[PDB]
Design a protein around this ligand. Structure first.
Ligand code: 78V
Ligand code: 78V
Ligand code: SAO
Ligand code: SAO
Lengths: 341, 343, 343, 343
């Protein structure tokens, strides 16, 4: 199957084991912004659901399917690969919705549905939007979508912006500098100092921050889920040209994302921007090993290249340069091993 | 091989990916009690190392081998299965000990060593001592130990004691009761409340606590690494009969461990007890599904049975009863997936 | 052929005496009330050590100390000064109507000839970390003019060194050095020079003051007795130390200050530049380690601070320090001539 | 050599020791206006460099030569007399430019170049442009310049303008009046007040200021590096006739400078004017010993004479008079010892 071909078993086991825990479902569900925004998007666009066939990709507890049921859907296929599918069924029964919500245990790339659906719902977004590679399952599921069918969310915007945060930088450098010691309990560790810096700086920093650390208006990269195919997400090339609004050291790039539910009645946005209330996605920052100095008015240009890997994540390559001076930085990050700060 | 036969590959992948990080090695190395005590044990027992052949099981960065070198070891075979072996190789070279230290990449159950050693060193202890099941790798390596050889550490003591922590116990239900609401965004979640409670109680709690919550002097279970076999750790039955020092509700059992380096010159102890400075092992608490009331002077008896699984961990089965009243409580826990509670 | 010229690069000497030729610098020194007031106290409170005596003032500058000696009743004061400040001193001697008692002799104390032997030598020859500027050697050299039963003001000097913790200072220097870490400064890769840069920045003693609570152990004292010492004694100054750590943490380096004692017939007067005392224009001096050493309370931090005099009227400082319990060792080289004024 | 003949060894040693520090180089490199403007001037005039032979006089870290390399230069001879030459060589190697940049250690007046160059680049500007006397080295280097070769910078403009700053003026006496007290610790210092005032007014003041203190349009003195000789800078006479735009007291003359890179594609300016972003050169003010009153419309005429000395600096003689009243003022300043006032 498409899933297994692109996924190491070791990663898959851990991945679906992780989501088999009720506590994580709770963790996601208690994100009121997330859950509330999804419910708002579905219910205020009830006509996109009324008497329609729905596919819920990765239903987990089934919350989105219940939202779909509340909006008047005739029949909802709720596909779930982890052992959470069993608990979802329990909830379907206890809520007397057996006639409208149908749990399909298994991976969306592998199960069989009896019919084509009018709309696909899912919450497949990870850190930096693309982490976990579930967007590909979401897009893969379009094999079950009627020609003029719809998707909730409809589009996803990734925002990139340069930031300055010396304390974060030195915080990481401090950690790496442990390996700078010439005599740790009499042992010279210095020969590994380089490897340590690499390892620590390969970690995207997951957390939130004040918006004023941003040195330029963000650049936007849009994925249209109605149009995109799986393969489009195997290699994601995001070119950027920032017009610096402030002078200073650029320590790296900050990432967040929005998704839009473009329904018939209205468009509803779910945003993880640092200007918006905090969500469990927070924001993600990729550090440069060495910061770049730029004056206000300069242009910071380059490319963020995301390469999907078999561990359900991405190898991140960031190349950025101050055009006016030729000051250049290249960096490689492992989105699979982030730093929760 | 013995390792792969007792280990789910997925778990192994994850396991050796974990230790391939310099940050995790650093994490262990910066635990001053651990590292310093190992160094102390090795150097203060220099006659156990000077001109000796040494085997370092799971050398990681190679720190213990360097300690062995400082103590005067003639030849040190440093075995390491993760990609940390590469960095150890680098450090051996940069510290000009290539003539004394030989890094061997691979699992100790699978690599070939050329000769028998005088002493084996290792740090194979996990949560509750036994987690990660590396102790078995440590014992397995005794196929390379001379009949009159030594083990550093030489013995390992796991300590169990009954505790009272009303808030910890009630916490589980406070969290589980999230699901006990008839209209979470219009959804009745209550049918899953029981499952949520179960899930939380299956997790051993990793963190520390004030020693005053302990209601009896601990019971000790000793593994003598010089004498024990690998197989001895597949099923570990720890019977206990606690003499209660305080009256109250017993919510479960607290776990910690000590290891002793018994050298020719002296014995050095490394302790993770809650009476001692905190280590990266912290302490572990397993809850009873139902608390048991015990009076001071009463006896709390039962068994902690540790059953090794192929996920490099243990299923913990605890049965306990107050002998004076017959009040009985049990729990079953999955040590591979503990709850890190420490704040 | 003078000892001064033999031990001093001319380039350094020119600059050195030009520096002190400025009235603004004299003002700077004179306006340090602790210094000036304490000197006056030491001299006047021991007036009988001066009354009707012959005095030598080594490096009189503006001549203030000679005036103190005159106030104390000295019969004749030879005020030796090598810079052009000697002329300004003469002016003050005349305008203060003391031409009959204070005699300015322009030139280096190693080169001028005095008409007679003196009963007491006074001077203010202390530099940063006491020994900087190498004027103590001129002070000691001047003892060729001292009567057998003569005295020295100051009589002794105590250097105090103690380990400190100051993460922010360390990071402050490392941040500066990290400029040379850049792989593309305007398209230029500077990284190959980071090692040289870190060296250069950490080669600088930090001159300023600090909170006494950053000190992690009671100070160690090294005493120079000016009555007994020879010039040659200060070419190589070896200060061994063994600190008993009072606090756990990272030792980022050693902090230095000094006291001098005026041991007079009537009383002993102390001039202290310790961080517990009111600030002086000497402040305190800290030598950073390139890598801090972790030590817990109760540990011993031992080693040596070695000062080698150079021809630039300063010292090459080599500090070697080790945590005895762990063998964690740090070595450092500092250039006392080029310190970092942080205040 | 020409250099040693015009320079006291003392000054030269201090001078090249100063620039031997990576931190000082860093200080210059971190001046974004300076460095960035040089890079722009070179790169935006790429036709002046593409496949050309280049001489970098006093390359320091070698940054300008790397800029020349970025512009497509065939061969750059980078001459450097301090120990920074060692580090420059390192950077050429690590940047894989050994085939195009040749570091030549030594003074440009003493080294030999293998061939003639098409263009000379350098940053020889000091305070008020002429300080350090490096412009003479820059001009001296034209013995290696092909006829019709180019100079980057091509010209240097020194700007002089009368200013009013009552507080700056009064500050001098405020400081000098320290010596005007009849009993400083019992000593009458007053006889030296005059000398202290003199000393303070001999120091050019380095810092920046509000442009509204300027009382007339600046007068400009231009050095064309393509045409000028070394000897032209031994005696620099700058006559001035200022047409006062504001009424008030003139306390002295303010100095700044611009340099122009006149390339084939465009002319790029580097300015240190008080109307422009601040540089490490700041601006320089020379006070009159007595302020001059001028009405708006009056004419302030006179001369600024710069006489080069062997300390790699200038003796500044300024004479000015208000033509309408005959009110006259003079001052003599020592540019080698300026007062860094900037805060
Ligand atoms: C750590 O930050 C929190 N976080 C991060 C990412 C994320 N992603 C939502 C996606 N849900 C995943 C659910 O679908 C399930 N499945 C994930 N991939 C699936 C597939 N191919 N086929 C079927 N089901 C699939 C999975 O088991 C889960 O129940 N949600 C979060 O709240
Ligand atoms: C700069 O930081 C603060 N600080 C540090 C050290 C210091 N030392 C006093 C030294 N001045 C006393 C005078 O001796 C003079 N001379 C110094 N060496 C001399 C010699 N060999 N012969 C004659 N005079 C000599 C020197 O010119 C001075 O004017 N004073 C300070 O306030
Ligand atoms: N069977 C095995 N063979 C070889 N290495 C192993 C095995 N099991 C675990 N390890 C390694 O054992 C190490 C335990 S961590 C202790 C590392 C080091 N001796 C120190 O004291 O800091 C990890 O680096 C694992 O990769
Ligand atoms: N006569 C001379 N010959 C060679 N180098 C010199 C001479 N005089 C000064 N220098 C050097 O010239 C440099 C001036 S500083 C400018 C450094 C570098 N070009 C930059 O743009 O950052 C210093 O490094 C001095 O050591």
């Amino acid at each position: 199957s498409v899933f297994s071909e692109r996924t190491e078993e070791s990663s898959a086991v851990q991945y679906f084991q992780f989501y088999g825990y009720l506590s994580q479902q709770q963790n996601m569900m208690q994100d009121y912004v997330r859950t509330g925004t999804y419910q708002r998007a579905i219910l205020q666009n009830h006509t996109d659901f009324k008497d329609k066939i729905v596919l819920d990709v990765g239903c987990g507890s089934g919350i989105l399917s219940f939202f779909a049921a509340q909006a008047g859907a005739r029949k909802i296929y709720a596909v779930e690969a982890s052992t959470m599918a069993q608990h979802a069924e329990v909830l379907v029964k206890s809520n007397n919705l057996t006639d409208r919500i149908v749990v399909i245990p298994g991976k969306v790339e592998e199960v069989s549905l009896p019919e084509q659906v009018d709309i696909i719902i899912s919450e497949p977004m990870g850190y930096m939007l693309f982490n976990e590679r579930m967007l590909e399952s979401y897009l893969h599921a379009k094999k079950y979508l009627k020609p003029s069918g719809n998707m909730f969310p409809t589009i996803g915007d990734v925002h990139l912006a340069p930031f300055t945060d010396e304390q974060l930088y030195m915080e990481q450098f401090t950690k790496a500098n442990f390996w700078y010691q010439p005599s740790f309990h009499g042992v010279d560790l210095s020969a590994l100092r380089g490897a340590a810096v690499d390892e620590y700086f390969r970690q995207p920093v997951v957390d939130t921050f004040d918006i004023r650390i941003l040195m330029a208006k963000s650049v936007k990269y849009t994925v249209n889920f109605l149009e995109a195919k799986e393969g489009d997400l195997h290699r994601i090339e995001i070119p950027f040209k920032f017009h610096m609004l402030h002078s200073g050291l650029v320590h790296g790039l900050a990432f967040w994302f929005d998704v839009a539910f473009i329904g018939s009645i209205m468009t509803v946005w779910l945003s993880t921007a640092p200007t918006e209330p905090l969500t469990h996605w927070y924001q993600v920052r990729c550090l440069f090993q060495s910061p770049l100095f730029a004056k206000a008015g300069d242009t910071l240009s380059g490319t963020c290249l995301l390469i999907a890997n078999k561990r359900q994540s991405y190898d991140i390559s960031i190349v950025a340069q101050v055009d006016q001076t030729g000051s250049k930085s290249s960096n490689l990050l492992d989105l699979k091993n982030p730093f929760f700060r």
